[PDB]
């Protein structure tokens, strides 16, 4: 469904004229849209955790895959409607806001890629999903280049990227030279005990943590996602970390790591004390996801640890969407733009934002709430599982580390609404024109979302407990 | 025709009787029911409806014009693909035994009982070798589980359908 | 708090100090064969505050010296290139102030504003014209950041985007192709921040009127 | 083996490339005449010289059309062996890079000068 | 490796240079003293070892010398004519055509993203 | 190996010193999967083993779409295009 | 061949005939590729074959804009052209019949001669005429492309003239920013040569839909030390009236000849009328018109100037300020032509 919109849109694409993009965007929204409500019968295939092997052992399919490839094309319907359709009909919303010929292309390849590395059963399947995803990423990235703040971030990109696929390669074929193997079924219990194989998973483990971004190599994906347009961050920022984390749950092979430990607690630490120091709203942001991978990093260290990262990735999913287009929606109320690209830099220019837009307030909140994890919103709720599932098995010091962080991450939380609910004097030099009703629309069901999903709450822990054991 | 390892018999991936594990192309298009044909026609004219519904709600430029008719033919083809891969996995699904399947599994009983009348094999005889036949049916096992990602369809006279 | 501090103006040739001039250097084409002069005086007066003189002439002669060269003829000053040794910054930060203005005296010359910034080139420079509207008199020209033209060699180029992030030095230069003296008497150069919309002509120049606003 | 001899080389030849690039830390200040490049003149007068989009990307795009040509190489040192399977496996290779191939033709990407 | 990626780095190269544009060289030091703290660590790292080298560096001590020659036995069981990249395209096409076709993708991807970032549509 | 882990180290190393020498800092991602493939060839070899092969020149063509990607980003950086667009619309 | 016989020759060819391949072969006969620097045959001498082509360049219509655009080379590689000839030819290709490319390309023309050949130099007053008609047709592209080259101009200035159409030309294409910017340099300048009824008209106009920064610019026009102008007072009235202020317009109408002593034309009235979208309110604008006004609207009826468009009847669930934008968005383009 995936290979056949690609090679659909790079024949139309091909032969349409520029002005054709935002039609084509649309088209391929309602194409996933119809692929989700159309298809989605599949999920029969996974009952009592069924699981199958594809593609002479190269790709594996269970519940688990299923539900980020839901989740993927999700968050690809909801960035490319934001693409597709025009937040308000002017001249400088047209500017701000206009897609790229290849930019659609991209997406769905970066998608592809992802999906291939969620569904990957062989180091060779993985490395190529690694290498397709990292290619699409950096063009994603790339394809914005009138500027040199961009364009720095896309080189730097690009290098630190070939790095640590580099490594990734390199801890592979080490694999392979000490099994003469490509997957990981010919590990056992015995195999692990009898032969010291640890550490070249420990590599691996690293070198595609820090393909998201964890500490102490933080500083240069924090700096892309300053940098790169806003509608390009808040895709590089979420999809390749979903992918590169659902492909270390199901890989399970970082159990009671001391490493891994420490790099989350460091992760943590990282997150939440060098967000205090941020006055930028893309760096804040960078920071915040940095935490929350933190988190979900967290649950690396334990076994059946399904629910929680699936309950945490999807509320993340969910809330960082929400965020992002609620600092797009801002954009309206502000006397002056920063750059074509990133037209808001500061947390003080959504000072006094709850006179211009109550309601976007009245959203931020309830999102910046569920980040810090005040209930009933879906984030107190996901780090509820996390607090449980660490104290199940014994991580009481992990556990403090964890509840110390959120703390001094509600801190500068509280910064962005603190600022927005002041009083800002300055009138505004645009008045009356009409957001777009779709966007609005996904943006409002999206804060439903995370007001009102835990009412489902014992009706996924059924679903889970009948679809994943 | 002979298979070269060792297969699961009568595997039960539902609550449904195994009809094939690896059903083919023409197989899974022959034993489609009616309202799989209208699943087909329901997304062949839901994308152009969608489209439509899209332009509707909020225009491209201001104003609300109809998506010319190379959009409209587009989506059009787009509706009926996704249609026949909905088709296809429900299809599957009945073959699998997953979904009821009691009209499948008797015509399915009929077909090879005519097969075996008739003094055939069971499920063709192929152009590939022995080898290429087990390298297809490994490839093309349960390949339904990734129609979001990409089609594949089992082209291949295999006999590693799991029945007996 | 402790966030990184934000503000709205940096002054960036600062000059009516002691000291002044050691923040900035010098450059004619004395550096080529040219004959053309360039020299910083600091004057110190009394009825107004002390400024910078930026005086030479600019004599476009040749170089018969030697024969690689084609066009001569330049004199510019620039803030001193940014020291960046082993843990101080690197450079300015101008990612909330889209503006930068001066306070100058002008005359018939036309100066350039030469911004320095970060580059994948060398030679690359984002130059904006100083626009004297008033001669003689001094006038607080303000150029808009993201106005500046990159030119690589003197030469207009693909229009990329400045890096504020990273800005090196801040000059006024002149690549006239005239001859004569030439002065400007400059007294400060910053970077200000985004002023709100104003329907007054200015506090520094007024115009007869009721004055309906109270007096102090 | 291989990680045993990455993990000790590191200190080594790491603390060389160390020693030999503070030596650098002062040296050549590049003192030379950058008065004519600081201010915006230009002396050539000529060597304007141009480069059209399509130009570069004939010089790119050589690279992965080659390495799709020569991924043709495994096929036909096998064709046999594979016949019918590989030979439908070769004929969506070929029809997936045709459709960039489409893309670069009707884009007219690769139109020198016209 | 060499008729196509270096000449196109070739190339790439003397397009810098016929209008003669250097590359501003921006200084290494401000990274050296990550460099020299990363060092460091990995220095010690190796170094409180100490005791535990000496029946770990003894590894590397026999992995170093290597001091048996490979025996080649003849076999008759291959017939036909058939090399290592007959192998790669039956393994290629057969058991890892899924990986062949990720590749077109791949090789479809690279094709795309230099017009992408390197044309001006319209 | 020998070989092709020695040339990785020196190739990982000059990138991570220099850092900022993009052309050469590319050729240190050239050479460093170079280094790599070396050695997944020479354990191919001693294990006779495919699947090593396979990997290489997977590992090759995924080399050559980076070089190719890489090479259009450093003209798009570099502005290789030139511009003479002085005195036109 | 005798400069005689040519008149009648060359007339033939353009004005009768058209034939723009045979035109360009005759005179690489006559004279001979002029690249060849040998000739560069004076128009004052002889401005007969100068004249034909003269007649069909500045003659040409829309579907024969293009053809104009090579006969304007022929002209200027052949015989040299007289400086004040390049007004009337970036009025030509430009502000008569469609063409706007043309325009910028003959002031780079005015630049490219200035800098290598030593023609004299282009004067601000073709970048403020062609910003003017740069923010008739949005042209986004020609903007950004003529703003650079008067970022780096060693021939001629900024000024006031520069600075006002500049601001209209970035209201046309939307830019907040770059409109500031604008507003910025003119305010920082004496009122003597500044803002003026010019500026006061752009600055109005860009804020059509803002009521709160519609009146305080109104406030600055006596700051500046100026007196409104009926097309000043237009735009205001507009601006009132499109956000909902019908009744306070009719005041401003009706007390504008007692304040000012500027009396109220036919393009104020019917500004009025057209942008008031309340049927009772609209009439309101009709009452003191035929008793106090009541030669000058007669003129209105016939002419079609009034035009009838309104909110709609159920209309309440939408917001009010909504529907004066949609009202007004409509209106605007009646007006546009
Ligand atoms: O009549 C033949 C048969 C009709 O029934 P039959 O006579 O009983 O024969 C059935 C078996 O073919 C009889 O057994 P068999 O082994 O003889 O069949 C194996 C088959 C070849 O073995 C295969 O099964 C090869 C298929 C490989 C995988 C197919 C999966 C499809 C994946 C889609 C691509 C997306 C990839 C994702 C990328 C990531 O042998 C052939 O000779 C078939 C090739 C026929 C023509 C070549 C291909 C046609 C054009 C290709 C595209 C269509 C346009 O149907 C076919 O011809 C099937 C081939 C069509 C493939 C469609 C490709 C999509
Ligand atoms: C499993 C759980 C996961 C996710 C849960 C999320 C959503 C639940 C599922 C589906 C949600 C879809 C609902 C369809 C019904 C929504 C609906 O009334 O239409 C639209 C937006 O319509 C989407 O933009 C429809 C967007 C469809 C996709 C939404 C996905 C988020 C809202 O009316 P509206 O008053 O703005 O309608 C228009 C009116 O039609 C025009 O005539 C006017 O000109 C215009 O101003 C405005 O009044
Ligand atoms: C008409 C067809 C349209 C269907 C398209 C669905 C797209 C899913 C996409 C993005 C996620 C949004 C929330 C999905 C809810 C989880 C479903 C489930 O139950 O999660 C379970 C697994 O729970 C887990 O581990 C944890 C899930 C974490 C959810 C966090 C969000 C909580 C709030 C959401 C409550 C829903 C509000 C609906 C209001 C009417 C998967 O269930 P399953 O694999 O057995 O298949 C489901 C049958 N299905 C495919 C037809 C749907």
Same mark, same amino acid.
Request: charged content about 15%; aromatic content about 12%.
């Given at each position: ?165 580099? =490594? ?121 996801? =940095? ?92 780090? =509820? ?85 | ?148 990602i990409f089609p594949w369809f089992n082209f291949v006279n295999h006999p590693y359908h799991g029945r007996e | 708090r402790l966030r990184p501090t934000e503000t709205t103006e940096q002054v960036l040739v600062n000059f009516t100090k002691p000291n002044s001039l050691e923040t900035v250097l010098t ?190 | ?25 002062? !040296?050549?200040? !590049? ?48 064709? !046999? ?34 | ?122 | ?89 | ?46 401005? @007969?074959?100068?004249?034909?082509? @003269?007649?069909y360049i500045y003659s040409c219509e829309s579907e024969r804009a293009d053809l104009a655009w090579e006969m304007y080379g022929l002209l200027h590689k052949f015989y040299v052209v007289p400086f004040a000839d390049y007004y009337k030819a970036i009025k030509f290709f430009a502000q008569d019949v ?15 001669? @200035?800098?290598? @050949? ?23 592209? &020609? ?46 300048l004496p009122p003597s040569i500044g803002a003026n009824n010019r500026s006061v008209d752009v600055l109005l106009s860009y804020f059509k839909d803002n009521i709160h920064y519609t009146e305080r610019t109104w406030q600055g026009i006596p700051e500046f030390g100026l007196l409104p102008t009926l ?29 000012? &002593? ?74 546009? &032509?």
């Amino acid at each position: 469904m995936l290979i056949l919109a690609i090679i659909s849109l790079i024949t139309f694409v091909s032969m349409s004229k520029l002005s054709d993009n935002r039609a084509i965007i649309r088209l391929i929204n309602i194409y996933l849209i119809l692929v989700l409500v159309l298809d989605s019968f599949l999920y029969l295939l996974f009952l009592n955790n069924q699981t199958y092997t594809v593609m002479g052992e190269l790709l594996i399919f269970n519940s688990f895959t299923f539900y980020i490839d839901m989740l993927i094309y999700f968050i690809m319907i909801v960035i490319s409607s934001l693409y597709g359709y025009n937040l308000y009909n002017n001249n400088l919303y047209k500017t701000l806001f206009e897609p790229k010929k290849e930019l659609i292309i991209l997406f769905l390849i970066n998608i592809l890629g992802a999906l291939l590395i969620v569904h990957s059963n062989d180091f060779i399947t993985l490395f190529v999903a690694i290498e397709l995803q990292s290619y699409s990423i950096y063009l994603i990235t790339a394809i914005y280049n009138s500027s040199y703040k961009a364009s720095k971030a896309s080189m730097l990109y690009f290098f630190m990227g070939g790095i640590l696929s580099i =490594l990734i390669a390199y801890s592979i074929n080490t694999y392979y030279s000490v099994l003469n193997s490509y997957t990981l079924h010919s590990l056992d219990s015995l195999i692990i005990n009898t032969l010291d194989l640890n550490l070249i998973l420990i590599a691996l483990s690293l070198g595609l943590l820090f393909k998201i971004g964890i500490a102490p190599l933080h500083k240069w994906l924090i700096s892309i996602y300053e940098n790169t347009p806003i509608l390009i961050t808040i895709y590089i920022s979420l999809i390749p970390k979903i992918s590169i984390l659902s492909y270390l749950v199901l890989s399970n092979i970082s159990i009671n790591s001391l490493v891994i430990s420490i790099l989350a607690i460091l992760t943590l630490l990282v997150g939440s004390v060098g967000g205090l120091l941020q006055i930028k709203i893309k760096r804040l942001l960078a920071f915040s996801g =940095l935490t929350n991978a933190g988190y979900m990093m967290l649950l690396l260290l334990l076994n059946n640890n399904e629910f929680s990262y699936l309950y945490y990735i999807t509320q993340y999913s969910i809330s960082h969407l929400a965020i992002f287009m609620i600092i797009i929606f801002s954009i309206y109320y502000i006397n002056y733009i920063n750059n074509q690209y990133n037209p808001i830099i500061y947390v003080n220019q959504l000072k006094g934002l709850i006179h211009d837009n109550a309601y976007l307030v009245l959203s931020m909140a309830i999102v910046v709430f569920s980040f810090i994890g005040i209930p009933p919103l879906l984030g107190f709720f996901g780090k =509820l599982n996390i607090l449980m599932s660490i104290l199940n098995n014994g991580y009481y010091f992990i556990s403090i580390v964890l509840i110390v962080a959120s703390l001094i991450s509600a801190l500068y939380y509280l910064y962005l609404l603190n600022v927005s609910i002041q009083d800002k004097n300055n009138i505004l030099i645009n008045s009356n024109e009409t957001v777009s009703s779709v966007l609005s629309y996904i943006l409002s069901s999206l804060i439903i979302l995370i007001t009102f999903g835990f009412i489902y709450n014992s009706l996924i822990i059924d679903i889970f407990n009948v679809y994943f054991n | 025709s002979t298979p070269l390892v060792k297969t699961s018999v009568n595997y039960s991936y539902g609550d449904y009787p195994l009809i094939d594990a690896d059903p083919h192309f023409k197989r899974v298009v022959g034993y489609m029911r009616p309202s799989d044909y209208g699943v087909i026609g329901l997304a062949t004219a839901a994308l152009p409806a969608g489209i439509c519904f899209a332009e509707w709600l909020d225009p491209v430029k201001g104003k609300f014009a109809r998506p010319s008719v190379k959009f409209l033919r587009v989506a059009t083809m787009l509706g009926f693909a996704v249609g026949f891969g909905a088709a296809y996995a429900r299809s599957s699904l009945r073959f699998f035994g997953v979904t009821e399947n009691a009209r499948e599994y008797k015509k399915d009983e009929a077909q090879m009982a005519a097969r075996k009348a008739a003094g055939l094999e069971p499920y063709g005889t192929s152009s590939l070798t022995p080898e290429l036949q087990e390298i297809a049916a490994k490839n093309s096992a349960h390949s339904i589980a990734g129609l979001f990602i990409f089609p594949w369809f089992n082209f291949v006279n295999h006999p590693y359908h799991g029945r007996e | 708090r402790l966030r990184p501090t934000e503000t709205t103006e940096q002054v960036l040739v600062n000059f009516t100090k002691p000291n002044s001039l050691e923040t900035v250097l010098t450059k004619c084409d004395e550096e080529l064969g040219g004959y053309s002069t360039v020299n910083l005086a600091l004057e110190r007066p009394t009825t107004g505050k002390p400024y910078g003189r930026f005086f030479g002439n600019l004599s476009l002669d040749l170089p018969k010296d030697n024969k690689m060269v084609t066009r001569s003829g330049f004199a510019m000053f620039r803030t001193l290139d940014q020291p960046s040794s082993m843990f101080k910054t690197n450079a300015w930060n101008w990612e909330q102030y889209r503006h930068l203005e001066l306070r100058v005296r002008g005359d018939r010359r036309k100066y350039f504003v030469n911004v320095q910034s970060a580059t994948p080139l060398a030679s690359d420079l984002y130059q904006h014209r100083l626009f004297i509207q008033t001669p003689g008199e001094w006038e607080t020209v303000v150029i808009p950041i993201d106005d500046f033209i990159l030119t690589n060699k003197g030469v207009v180029q693909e229009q990329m985007a400045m890096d504020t992030a990273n800005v090196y030095t801040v000059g006024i230069g002149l690549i006239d192709r005239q001859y004569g003296p030439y002065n400007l008497d400059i007294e400060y150069i910053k970077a200000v921040a985004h002023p709100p919309l104003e329907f007054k002509p200015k506090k520094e120049y007024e115009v007869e009127k009721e004055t309906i606003l109270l007096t102090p | 083996n291989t990680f045993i001899i990455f993990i000790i080389l590191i200190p080594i030849v790491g603390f060389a490339l160390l020693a030999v690039n503070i030596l650098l830390a002062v !040296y050549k200040p !590049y003192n030379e005449k950058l008065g004519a490049f600081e201010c915006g003149l230009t002396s050539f007068n000529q060597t304007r010289l141009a480069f059209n989009a399509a130009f570069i990307l004939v010089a790119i795009l050589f690279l992965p059309f080659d390495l799709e040509i020569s991924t043709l190489l495994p096929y036909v040192m096998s064709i !046999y062996l594979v016949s019918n399977y590989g030979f439908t496996i070769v004929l969506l290779f070929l029809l997936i890079l045709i459709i960039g191939f489409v893309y670069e033709i009707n884009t007219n990407a690769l139109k020198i000068n016209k | 490796y060499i008729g196509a990626i270096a000449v196109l780095f070739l190339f790439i190269i003397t397009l810098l240079d016929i209008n003669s544009t250097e590359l501003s060289v921006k200084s290494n030091i401000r990274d050296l003293p990550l460099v020299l703290i990363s060092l460091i660590v990995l220095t010690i790292s190796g170094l409180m070892i100490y005791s535990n080298d000496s029946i770990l560096i003894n590894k590397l001590l026999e992995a170093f010398g290597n001091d048996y020659n490979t025996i080649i036995t003849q076999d008759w069981f291959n017939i036909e004519n058939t090399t290592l990249l007959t192998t790669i395209g039956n393994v290629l096409l057969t058991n890892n055509a899924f990986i062949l076709l990720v590749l077109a993708i791949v090789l479809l991807l690279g094709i795309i993203g230099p017009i992408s970032i390197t044309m001006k549509h319209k | 190996m020998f070989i092709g882990t020695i040339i990785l180290v020196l190739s990982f190393l000059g990138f991570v010193f220099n850092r900022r020498n993009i052309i050469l800092a590319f050729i240190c991602l050239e050479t460093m999967l170079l280094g790599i493939n070396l050695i997944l060839l020479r354990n191919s070899v001693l294990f006779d083993d495919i699947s090593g092969s396979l990997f290489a020149i997977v590992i090759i063509i995924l080399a050559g779409v980076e070089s190719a990607i890489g090479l259009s980003l450093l003209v798009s950086y570099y502005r290789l295009r030139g511009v003479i667009n002085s005195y036109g619309i | 061949i005798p400069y005689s016989a040519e008149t009648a020759i060359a007339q033939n060819v353009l004005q009768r005939h058209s034939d723009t391949a045979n035109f360009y072969t005759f005179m690489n006969r006559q004279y001979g590729n002029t690249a060849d620097k040998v000739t560069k045959q004076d128009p004052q001498i002889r401005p @007969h074959t100068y004249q034909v082509i @003269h007649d069909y360049i500045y003659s040409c219509e829309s579907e024969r804009a293009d053809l104009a655009w090579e006969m304007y080379g022929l002209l200027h590689k052949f015989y040299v052209v007289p400086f004040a000839d390049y007004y009337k030819a970036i009025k030509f290709f430009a502000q008569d019949v469609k063409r706007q490319d043309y325009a910028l390309l003959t002031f780079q023309q005015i630049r490219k001669n @200035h800098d290598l @050949h030593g023609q004299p130099a282009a004067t601000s007053e073709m970048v403020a005429f062609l910003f003017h008609e740069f923010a008739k047709t949005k042209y986004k592209r &020609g903007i950004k492309r003529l703003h650079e080259v008067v970022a780096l101009e060693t021939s001629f200035d900024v000024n006031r003239d520069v600075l006002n159409e500049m601001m209209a030309a970035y209201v046309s294409v939307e830019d907040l920013n770059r409109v500031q910017d604008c507003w910025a340099q003119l305010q920082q300048l004496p009122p003597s040569i500044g803002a003026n009824n010019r500026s006061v008209d752009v600055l109005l106009s860009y804020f059509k839909d803002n009521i709160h920064y519609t009146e305080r610019t109104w406030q600055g026009i006596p700051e500046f030390g100026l007196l409104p102008t009926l097309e000043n007072y237009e735009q205001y009235l507009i601006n009132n009236c499109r956000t909902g202020n019908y009744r306070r317009a009719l005041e401003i109408t009706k007390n504008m000849e007692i304040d000012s &002593g500027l009396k109220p034309t036919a393009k104020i009235i019917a500004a009025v009328y057209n942008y008031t979208f309340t049927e009772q309110r609209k009439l309101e604008v009709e009452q003191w018109a035929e008793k106090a006004h009541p030669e000058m609207w007669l003129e209105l009826k016939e002419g079609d100037k009034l035009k009838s468009l309104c909110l709609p009847a159920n209309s309440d669930n939408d917001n009010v300020e909504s529907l004066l934008k949609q009202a007004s968005a409509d209106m605007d383009e009646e007006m546009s &032509g």
